[PDB]
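Why predict the complex rather than its parts? Because the way molecules touch one another can change local conformation, and only a joint prediction can capture that. The input here totals 97 residues.
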Amino acid sequence: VQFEQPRRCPTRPEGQNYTEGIAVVFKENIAPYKFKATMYYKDVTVSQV
Amino acid sequence: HQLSRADVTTVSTFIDLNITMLEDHEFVPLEVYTRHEIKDSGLLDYTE
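Output of the joint prediction:
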């Protein structure tokens, strides 16, 4: 018999490469468009007594 | 005569240890009810 000779050891994987950056994350807009309006009308009442 | 190492039986002094990496996992979006379903669960919609 003979002793097994040294095995090839695992290596540390390269690792992940990361790009630094700034981000803005946008979602679907669900907010209604809002604006200002002015109503001009006249309450007309006719009473029969 | 000479001979190859493969001609001699091999016994190991090494202790085995088998480590495997945790594989990648992808999480998909998943909701029980969407907003459309929640809004549609009303019987009358005042706006409509």
